[PDB]
Amino acid sequence: MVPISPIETVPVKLKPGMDGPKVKQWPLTEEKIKALVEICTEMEKEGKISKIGPENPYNTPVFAIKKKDSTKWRKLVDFRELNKRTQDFWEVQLGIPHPAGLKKKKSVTVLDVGDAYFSVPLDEDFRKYTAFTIPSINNETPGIRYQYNVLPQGWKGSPAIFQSSMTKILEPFAAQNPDIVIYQYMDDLYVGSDLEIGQHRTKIEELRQHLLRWGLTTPDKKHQKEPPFLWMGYELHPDKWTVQPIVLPEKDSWTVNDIQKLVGKLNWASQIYPGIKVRQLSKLLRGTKALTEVIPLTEEAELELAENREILKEPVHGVYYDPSKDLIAEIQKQGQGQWTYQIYQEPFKNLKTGKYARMRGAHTNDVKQLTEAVQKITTESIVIWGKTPKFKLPIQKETWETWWTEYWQATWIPEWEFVNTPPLVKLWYQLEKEPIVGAETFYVDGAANRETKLGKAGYVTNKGRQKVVPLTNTTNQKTELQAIYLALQDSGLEVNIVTDSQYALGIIQAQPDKSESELVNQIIEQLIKKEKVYLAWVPAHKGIGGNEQVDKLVSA
Amino acid sequence: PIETVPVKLKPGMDGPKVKQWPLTEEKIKALVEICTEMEKEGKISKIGPENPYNTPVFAIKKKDSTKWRKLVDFRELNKRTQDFWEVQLGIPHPAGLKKKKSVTVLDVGDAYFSVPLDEDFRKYTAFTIPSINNETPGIRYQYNVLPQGWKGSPAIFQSSMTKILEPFKKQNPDIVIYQYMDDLYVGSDLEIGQHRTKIEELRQHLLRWGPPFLWMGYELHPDKWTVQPIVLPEKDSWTVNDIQKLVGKLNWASQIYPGIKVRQLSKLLRGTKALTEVIPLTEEAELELAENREILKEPVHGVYYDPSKDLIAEIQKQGQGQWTYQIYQEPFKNLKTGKYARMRGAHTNDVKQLTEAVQKITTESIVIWGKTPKFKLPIQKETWETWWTEYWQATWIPEWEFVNTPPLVKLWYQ
Ligand SMILES: Cc1cc(/C=C/C#N)cc(C)c1Oc1nc(NC2CCN(Cc3ccc(S(C)(=O)=O)cc3)CC2)nc2ncccc12
């Protein structure tokens, strides 16, 4: 007998106040009972479970289920009640590595550790809560009562405790063998190195030797599956990675779950297939939640989808990360609030790709969106590589400098350089900081009757130019914008505009270059055509003449 | 120190469960070194998956120093930790501090590590050193001793600290000492020369009576802190535009000050005049201007600090590296206003300047009232939240919200 170290127990509690499960065992057929008795007798011999007396008052139902070609029965202990009552754990497997962060390894071997799983003991004070009962034949004897000694499959804590237990066991081996990497995914351990095949298998042997100190028998994962590993939706090849094949179904009638799966696939594909777009397809499913409703395709979705198919025609792959090389991120504007990017170390060999879509909102501009794309990539790059990439942006250095020095908010973009890749991001208008000498001054105003929805918008100028337009189905705020719009329409290339509209100022000072309000869009289009616009604000109802004059003209 | 102090969360409140945000490789490496030593010294221990709580952690370089410092973001645990009256119904915040001619700030947080933490509360101080790209399990730890940044640490340590200070205090009856979180504020009216020596006299005391960053001093002169009253221009020729801006600013001021009038000034804007036309002021408009100017000199009336209410700090980017700010509890009742320029290190970095402005304003707030304000930051949340930790140099962290629509009022503190 070679002494083995015990695996340290994780202490476990139920959620505060709650007691353990007490769920009735269902009746079972004579055949299922016999099956369960044999299964449980075996597991009992293996130490997995123990027979208990009648004093334990907890219970969890057990079931017997058959499989198709394996004419075996299998047991299922339904721990759903127990899981509802079990404390929360730290789930160390939340984050999945992204393949583009991984480092190329000359050699990787796989080890089955599912057998080591049953060496992890369950906290003795908790075992009582795992009791279950095999009903007896013809219910003429007391049911056989058992509780777990090991982490039960299907129990809330088993993944976290099993993974924590292995990690602690592995820690000294990893720390003292820095030339290898070890990764656990479910019942398998992956060990990679850049050692030659001979020196690699000795590290494997040494690791087996280390595991045997806790009595863990670990042979090679039987039926060694040739590369690539199929893992978390990816293909991990030795020198490249990609998403598992993406095939977009040919359809005549597209329903709302057809497109959720389609945008899911496209989103998943976009981490490596450059230029994927999903705005038009995503737009088609705003409010519906009946997963069977068929939606007609906008011709802009058919165009977008067909574009996606062209991108998906050939498989593409990403390279793994080399920490000795630089990290570079390149962004292109695609239109309609859509942005796409590539991250690479040497040109034409992407580590990964991705996309960004504009936030919901009434007014927006390209610079803000580019800035948001940059922050998204920055953060994703911190996650994957622990550092910020250098950016290549389709915005001239002077555009950016003008934007951020005049923008009312603090803003910042990390180290970057211009790349001349149209369409370029630009400022479409720049308001004046001072009134323009010799430009006509327009005093604008608008007003609407909240009941009738009838309004008026217009202006008066220092040259005696005047206009009032009657409007139907409008609001104070819309008439205030309409008045500014009229002044832009009716003035020369340079104009001073005086308004009392805090609403219109709030919008225009936000510097949008596009809007969901068509009137705001018309205003932007006028601003682009001007040479100089100075927009001045004054408070309403203060006897500011010109303002006062047109206020009366529009108030009916 | 062997005896623990019983501490509990507020009723019906679990411990914090805050996600660790992603960290750069260099900050991760710094934390691994720091926590390895802390672990050797007993300050923290590894924890198991049966602990589900988490508080974010990161690393900073304090002002003008080489070594990384661990900084735990205990804002969530602080608000969940019971209110404290450790041995006393409360310390009066010293109104004397803001009047001293010089205040030096000491990082005394290392002293907390000599007091053990209540064994039942330790679980709630759990934190995670993340790995890059989730490649290895995060390193999980909890505190065994009073942690830096935690609200309870100065509270529990306050008995032990009053005694260390006692010989120094009864020696210097006119030296004002205030403790806020991990900081010690030490104010004297004497001039420079004596200060660094007296502060070092205070430093030695803690070494004799007991540190990585204890050697440093942050020097402040609150007696020279300048307020920003509201100013009206003085001009010999007023354009229509000038008068319009003036009437706007005065109409905004009339919400703060009684008896501002703009009738006579508005009367000059009669007709529909070109913006650049010079309007001579009538004497009755000049009188009105003079009266308003007089009103604006005096303080705002009915302005009182209410310790039950939050302090609110608004900040405006004015361009060219200038920032204005106002601290208040009720709108239009400013308790303090200010302006900053020439934020060193950041002439081409908005967010770095904003981060330093936030730290200077918080420092002013601790000194004047003994607490931190809730900020209204002129920045998009995603920009701020990506970058501020790169420029953070204080051992506390205030709360903040974001302003997305441009205030008209930036104009009237220019
Ligand atoms: C070791 C490991 C395996 C998996 C598998 C999942 C499944 N199912 C997943 C991860 C995350 C993982 O952990 C880490 N992986 C890596 N790099 C990867 C890069 C891709 N290759 C693919 C490959 C190469 C060679 C062969 S071969 C011998 O020719 O047959 C066959 C396949 C494996 C190693 N670097 C790491 N660095 C630091 C820490 C951990 C790292």
Ligand SMILES: [Mg+2]
């Ligand atoms: Mg009006």
